[PDB]
Design an enzyme around this catalytic site. Structure first.
Site, PDB file in Angstrom:
ATOM      1  N   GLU A 174      -5.303 -11.265   5.311  1.00 49.06           N
ATOM      2  CA  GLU A 174      -5.740 -10.016   4.773  1.00 49.06           C
ATOM      3  C   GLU A 174      -7.635  -9.943   3.978  1.00 49.06           C
ATOM      4  O   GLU A 174      -7.508  -8.980   3.403  1.00 49.06           O
ATOM      5  CB  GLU A 174      -4.801 -10.178   3.125  1.00 49.06           C
ATOM      6  N   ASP A 208      -8.442  -0.356   3.452  1.00 44.95           N
ATOM      7  CA  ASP A 208      -7.982  -1.468   4.098  1.00 44.95           C
ATOM      8  C   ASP A 208      -8.393  -0.903   5.515  1.00 44.95           C
ATOM      9  O   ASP A 208      -8.947   0.514   5.695  1.00 44.95           O
ATOM     10  CB  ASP A 208      -6.542  -1.060   4.169  1.00 44.95           C
TER      11      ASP A 208
END
Ligand SMILES: [Cl-]
Ligand SMILES: [Cl-]
Length: 162
Positions: free
Chosen positions: A11, A20
């Protein structure tokens, strides 16, 4: 290697709100803030999550705090889910880390929807499950990450992360 290091690799860490891979407002170590397009709705959820007026920026400690909560909630969701729990219970320690990773990225609901791959993992048909997992929007959309998780499920080792 452990679940924390694995997800930190997948991540990354950003201290400023970012979007994202699906274009949703996120911060820290993959902490989704909101699916709304509003940067304002995002800044609001952010302040709410941290307990302070942040002006869209957090410290490392704060990120790691969100992270710890997030992992814990991932695991608790798995153990609370009738479809996921039994798979988890059946797996060895490394593989468990891989299911957590999926849940963290795609939520309990999304993972639970991988019915066929789940059955295969429970049967310990590693290579078959790996092939099935790859026939997914997940794999097509974030192929490098999906490969790493898949390899983890296939081998039961941390090689993909080494
Ligand atoms: Cl929160
Ligand atoms: Cl990727």
């Amino acid at each position: 290697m452990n679940i924390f290091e694995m997800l930190r690799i997948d991540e990354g860490l950003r201290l400023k709100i970012y979007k994202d891979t699906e274009g949703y407002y996120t911060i820290g170590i993959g902490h989704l803030l909101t699916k709304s397009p509003s940067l304002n709705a995002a800044a609001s959820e952010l302040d709410k999550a941290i307990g302070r007026n942040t002006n869209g920026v957090i410290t490392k400690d704060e990120a790691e705090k969100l992270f710890n909560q997030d992992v814990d909630a991932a695991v608790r969701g798995i153990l609370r889910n009738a479809k996921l729990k039994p798979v988890y219970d059946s797996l060895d320690a490394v593989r468990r880390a891989a299911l957590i990773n999926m849940v963290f990225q795609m939520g309990e609901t999304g993972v639970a929807g991988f019915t066929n791959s789940l059955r295969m993992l429970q049967q310990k048909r590693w290579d078959e499950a790996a092939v099935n997992l790859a026939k997914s929007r997940w794999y097509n959309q974030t192929p490098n990450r999906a490969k790493r998780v898949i390899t983890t499920f296939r081998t039961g080792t941390w090689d993909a992360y080494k």
